Amino acid sequence: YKHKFDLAAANIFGGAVRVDVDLDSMPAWMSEKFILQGSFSVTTAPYAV
Amino acid sequence: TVLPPADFLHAWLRHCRLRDELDALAGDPSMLSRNVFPDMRLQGRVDILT
Look at A40 and B45 and tell me if their CB atoms are within 8 Å. no
Q: Say whether residue A48 is in contact with chain B using an 8 A CB cutoff.
A: no
- The experimental technique behind this entry is cryo-EM
| Cα gap A22→A28, rounded to integer Å | 12
Query: Cα separation of A4 and B38, whole Å?
Result: 83
Q: Do A44 and B40 meet the contact criterion of CB atoms below 8 Å apart? A: yes
What letters, b where the CB count within 10 A reaches 16 and e where it falls short, cover B21-36? eeeeeeeeeeeeeeee
CB-side neighbour CA atoms (13 Å) of B27: 3
DSSP E strands, chain A: 35-37, 42-43
> CA-to-CA distance for B24 and B18, rounded, in angstroms?
10
Q: Does A40 touch chain B (CB under 8 A)?
A: yes
Alpha-carbon gap, residue A6 to A41, rounded angstroms: 69
Resolution (in Å) of the shown entry? 3.5
Cβ within 8 Å of residue A47, ≥6 positions away? B39
Facing residues of A37 across strands? B47
